[PDB]
Ligand binder design. Structure first.
Ligand SMILES: [Mg+2]
Lengths: 49, 98, 48, 146, 338, 195, 73, 73
């Protein structure tokens, strides 16, 4: 939902997430940059970090 | 002395592809214009008739290593799209060697 | 509307439109330790 | 002194002008409507432009700088050489259709007033189009990355 | 005896025409492929040539079969072949080998007869199979009821329809339904499609009366803001009213062939045929608007993605796509369109 | 599976952001392609289709092409039936029973031309032979129909080939692996009918 | 000098800078003698802003008119 | 909202006889006059006033005055 809200109707996505109480795992590039975490690609994966 | 062996990233927007940002080793020159290598122009898609470049400075050791290895211009000869060489002789050079 | 002829942007008005988080973070922010300048052709330089 | 104009250009122009006159005469006869007349004239003049380009290519010596630059792959193309030393050819009206009457004069000779005015249409159209061209490209790129 | 020889001669000539037709298409395809690959000219010039060649290629393809309809002979004995394309002989002063049926010279093919001799000799008509000529000839009730039954669905109120609005007790008379029905029928769209016109006319007339009646003596000269907002507010409430919706359903409501057909008789080919007359109304396609908003919301981001003029680093300040196309046009650019 | 990284020339390294590279490679030459008309006034440009960005969009979005063409559901002998202005085709299986039929075809569209160099016949005629999924008209097939007739792998190959042909016809050179990476995201979901 | 004799197609009662794409900024065949068809800003205001020709004076009504030489026989 | 042209003609002070005597060239307008239901000039003014602003009471004097005020002042 964190990535979905980037390019979708934020209110609708947030409402659907809140009602479902589902959690987003931070696997990807769109959501990680928002959180400030280093991207899970290239040098940023756990294998090399 | 401090500037020695400190990579600096050069960028030319719009960055249509990853080669639009490349790391170079800076050397002090008197003036107001950034001197750019003639070969990388095709990678940046720029001509010296008023274009300007943006310069960014890595600080942390990880960032400096990243610029030195991954993003160094000397390590990005081939185009990631198809592998055809991208930093090759152009215009005058082609007229010369020909 | 308040003063003028424009609505007051409430909480959800934020992080929903062109402005506000979930947006304007994928548009571009300004950074320090950076500069801009015109370029000239340097034939004496090495590729690196 | 290096921009050489082929001597065969005049013959091609005269022959294709005669063919265009024949097309006009047939249009007057009622055997053609307006759109088909324009299409036939456009085809005739495109063929004339191709012939002039071929004559220019076969006339220029291999050591001439203008053709040497293009042939070595340094930059440019033979269409630009034809425009510079051959004939401009057909140009586009603002609506986007080819004007049946082409531009005979080469830029070396110098376009006349009316030829320059009709040529300005395509230049303005392209300079306006070049920016709008990137909108859909960026749209597709951001779809692809998303 | 000569019919077999005559047919063979006509077969050869039609083959001769196809020889030119195929040669022209091959030349166009080479030009079209070359223009796409290595035009070398300006972008406008590249597109203009490509469009003309692509348009020309399609023009030839459509005529690839049944190119000729027949040969016309005039008092001058000229061979005025009639076909789907205008083919001329460049080597012979562009002498027309085959005239187009739309050309003025090909006029007598349809407006000439022995009783109307527009300088026409024997006239021939070709019968063809594939790319070859086979032979030639020479010369010298319930459907109306179904629509009428459908029209009966668009009735009029027997007594004035009371809207019973929230604030003003609105009423709908037979004249409003009669006027509303007339506009719906004038458009010519099906009964399901004409509902939008009927609803718009009915809603507009009712809304105007309510807006003025409510503010009668209070909103007469204050047209600065109290002249259009109230109509929209009344429209929003009116469209949601249950009684108003039922009143519209009373006359000229949504109809189906099964319900309509049963009512007409109790008052297969018809069912399938009546479907086209019934059509569809796209009733409250809110989801489509959501997709429109989503696409429009997307494009505004796409335009914002691109470089702004705040910090430009080009040789000169050139025009940008943000100055030519807006989000709505960019969103509408990639619609289904089918 | 990915193969060597075109930038380095060796086997791709773990953690490589293949998706971003593929998207950027596809999008960078987008401006070099032919594009639909910008004239607001005039006539709709869809009919005068040009093989460029509109076609790339038509492929990637997995929409039904405007100028759709049919395909052969079952391999067998093809019988072509002429009519006043339309025409009908029927395929009788050589290793089966019932014969499939297509009847909405019209003479206004050229029939698919056999591209075999030595055959030289061109348009397929009566009594010819076709295989499953073979196209019967000149134009663009329907990806959904291809997926229905054949397996998921076949439709992916068809999409990759179509996009690569569109990009190559205009001089832009892009490796097939990027197109495959883009396409792979379109077959990652399975629709469930019943639980 | 060029600024003073400038023909703008925007402002109060004019066209927006984000509208009229390739429809009002095209060179109409009537510019000849009344509006220079080659010289115009390359920025956002391409086509919208032009310059008056050398031989041109505004009609009291407000229509740009140009001179011509009478030809008889 | 679309209205018959004959309604406007009658409002100005035209009648069926003059319309059918003068506008006898084009058949479309003949059809429009056939479809027209207004009989007299006064009804045309009243009809126009009702269609414009149904909310206000329809009277002949105000109907004429509004149309007179609309464009002829
Ligand atoms: Mg520049």
């Amino acid at each position: 939902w964190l990535s979905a809200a980037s390019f979708q109707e934020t209110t609708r996505v947030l409402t659907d997430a809140a009602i479902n109480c589902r959690s987003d795992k931070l696997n990807g590039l769109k959501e990680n940059v928002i959180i400030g975490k280093l991207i899970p690609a290239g040098t940023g994966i756990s294998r090399y970090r | 002395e401090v500037i020695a062996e400190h990579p600096v990233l050069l960028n030319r927007a719009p960055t249509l592809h990853r080669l639009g940002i490349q790391a170079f080793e800076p050397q002090l020159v008197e003036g107001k214009a950034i001197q750019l290598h003639p070969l990388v122009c095709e990678a940046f898609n720029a001509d010296f008739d008023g274009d300007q470049m943006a310069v960014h400075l890595p600080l942390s050791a990880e960032a400096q290593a990243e610029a030195r290895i991954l993003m160094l211009s000397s390590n990005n000869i081939l185009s990631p799209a198809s592998g055809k060489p991208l930093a090759m002789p152009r215009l005058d050079m082609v007229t010369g060697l020909y | 509307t308040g003063p003028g002829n424009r609505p007051l942007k409430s909480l959800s008005d934020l992080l929903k439109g062109k402005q506000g988080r979930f947006r304007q973070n994928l548009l571009g922010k300004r950074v320090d330790y950076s500069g801009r300048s015109v370029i000239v052709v340097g034939p004496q330089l090495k590729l690196h | 002194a290096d921009v050489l104009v082929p001597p065969q250009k005049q013959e091609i122009l005269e022959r294709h002008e005669a063919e265009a006159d024949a097309i006009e005469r047939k249009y007057q006869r009622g055997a053609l409507n307006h759109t088909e007349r324009n299409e036939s004239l456009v085809k005739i003049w495109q063929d004339a432009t191709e012939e002039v380009g071929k004559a220019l290519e076969e006339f220029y010596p291999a050591d001439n700088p203008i053709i040497t630059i293009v042939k070595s792959g340094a930059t440019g193309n033979l269409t630009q050489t034809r425009t510079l030393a051959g004939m401009k050819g057909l140009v586009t009206n603002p609506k986007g259709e080819f004007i049946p009457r082409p531009i005979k004069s080469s830029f070396r000779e110098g376009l006349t007033v009316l030829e320059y005015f009709i040529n300005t249409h395509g230049a303005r159209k392209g300079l306006a189009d070049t920016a709008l061209r990137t909108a859909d490209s960026g749209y597709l790129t951001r779809r692809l990355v998303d | 005896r000569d019919y077999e020889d005559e047919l063979q001669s006509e077969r050869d000539y039609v083959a001769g025409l196809y020889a030119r037709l195929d040669a022209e298409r091959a030349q166009s395809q080479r030009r079209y492929a070359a223009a796409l690959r290595e035009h070398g000219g300006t972008a406008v010039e590249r597109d203009a040539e490509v469009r003309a060649l692509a348009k020309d290629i399609a023009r030839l393809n459509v005529a690839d079969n049944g190119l000729c309809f027949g040969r016309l002979d005039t008092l001058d004995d000229a061979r005025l072949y009639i076909g789907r394309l205008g083919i001329f002989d460049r080597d012979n002063d562009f002498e027309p080998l085959l005239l187009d049926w739309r050309a003025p010279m090909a006029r007598p093919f349809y407006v000439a007869t022995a009783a109307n001799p527009e300088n026409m000799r024997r006239r021939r008509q070709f019968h063809t199979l594939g790319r070859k000529v086979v032979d030639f000839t020479d010369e010298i009730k319930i459907l109306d009821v179904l629509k009428a039954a459908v029209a009966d669905r668009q009735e009029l109120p027997s007594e004035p329809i009371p809207i019973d609005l929230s604030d003003v007790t609105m009423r709908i008379d037979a004249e409003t339904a009669k006027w509303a029905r007339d506009e719906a029928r004038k458009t010519g769209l099906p009964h399901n499609e004409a509902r939008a016109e009927f609803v718009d006319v009915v809603t507009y007339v009712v809304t105007e009366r309510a807006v003025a009646r409510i503010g009668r003596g209070w909103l007469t000269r204050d047209d600065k803001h109290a002249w259009e907002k109230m109509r929209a507010d009344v429209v929003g409430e009116l469209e949601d009213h249950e009684q108003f919706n039922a009143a519209l359903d009373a006359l000229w409501p949504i109809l189906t062939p099964e319900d309509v057909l049963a009512q007409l008789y109790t008052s297969v080919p018809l069912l399938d045929e009546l479907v086209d007359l019934l059509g569809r109304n796209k009733a409250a396609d809110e989801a489509a608007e959501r997709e429109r908003r989503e696409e429009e919301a997307y494009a505004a981001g796409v335009l914002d993605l691109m470089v702004d003029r705040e910090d430009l680093m080009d040789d000169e300040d050139h025009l940008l796509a943000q100055d030519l196309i807006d989000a709505e046009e960019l969103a509408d650019r990639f619609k289904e369109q089918d | 599976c990915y193969g060597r990284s075109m930038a380095t020339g060796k086997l791709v390294d773990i953690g490589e952001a293949v998706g971003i590279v593929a998207a950027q490679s596809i999008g960078e030459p987008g401006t070099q392609l032919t594009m639909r008309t910008f004239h607001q006034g005039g006539v709709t440009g869809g009919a005068d289709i040009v093989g460029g960005l509109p076609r790339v969009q038509e492929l990637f979005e997995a929409r039904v092409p405007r100028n759709k063409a049919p395909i052969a559901d079952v391999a067998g002998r093809v019988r072509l039936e002429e009519s006043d202005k339309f025409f009908k085709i029927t395929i009788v299986p050589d290793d089966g029973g019932e014969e499939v039929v297509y009847d909405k075809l019209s003479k206004r569209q050229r029939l698919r031309v056999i591209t075999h160099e030595d055959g030289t016949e061109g348009v397929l005629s009566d009594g010819d032979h076709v295989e499953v999924g073979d196209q019967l008209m000149e134009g663009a097939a329907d990806p959904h129909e291809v997926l229905r007739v054949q397996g998921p792998r076949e439709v992916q190959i068809h999409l990759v080939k179509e996009v690569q042909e569109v990009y190559r016809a205009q001089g832009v050179s892009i490796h097939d692996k990027h197109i495959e990476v883009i396409v792979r995201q379109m077959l990652r979901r399975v629709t469930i009918i019943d639980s | 000098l060029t600024h003073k004799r400038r023909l703008s197609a925007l402002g109060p009662g004019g066209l927006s800078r984000e509208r009229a794409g390739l429809e009002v900024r095209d060179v109409h065949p009537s510019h000849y003698g009344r509006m220079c068809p080659i010289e115009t800003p390359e920025g956002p205001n391409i086509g919208l802003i032009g310059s008056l020709s050398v031989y041109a004076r505004v009609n009291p009504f407000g229509f740009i008119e140009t001179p011509y030489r009478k030809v008889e026989n | 909202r679309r209205q018959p042209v004959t309604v406007l003609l009658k409002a100005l002070g035209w009648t069926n006889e003059q319309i059918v005597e003068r506008f006898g060239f084009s058949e479309i307008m003949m059809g429009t006059l056939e479809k027209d239901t207004t009989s007299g000039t006064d009804e045309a003014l009243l009809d126009i006033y009702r269609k414009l602003r149904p909310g206000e009471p329809p009277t002949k004097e105000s109907a004429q005055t509004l149309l007179e005020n609309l464009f002829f002042k």
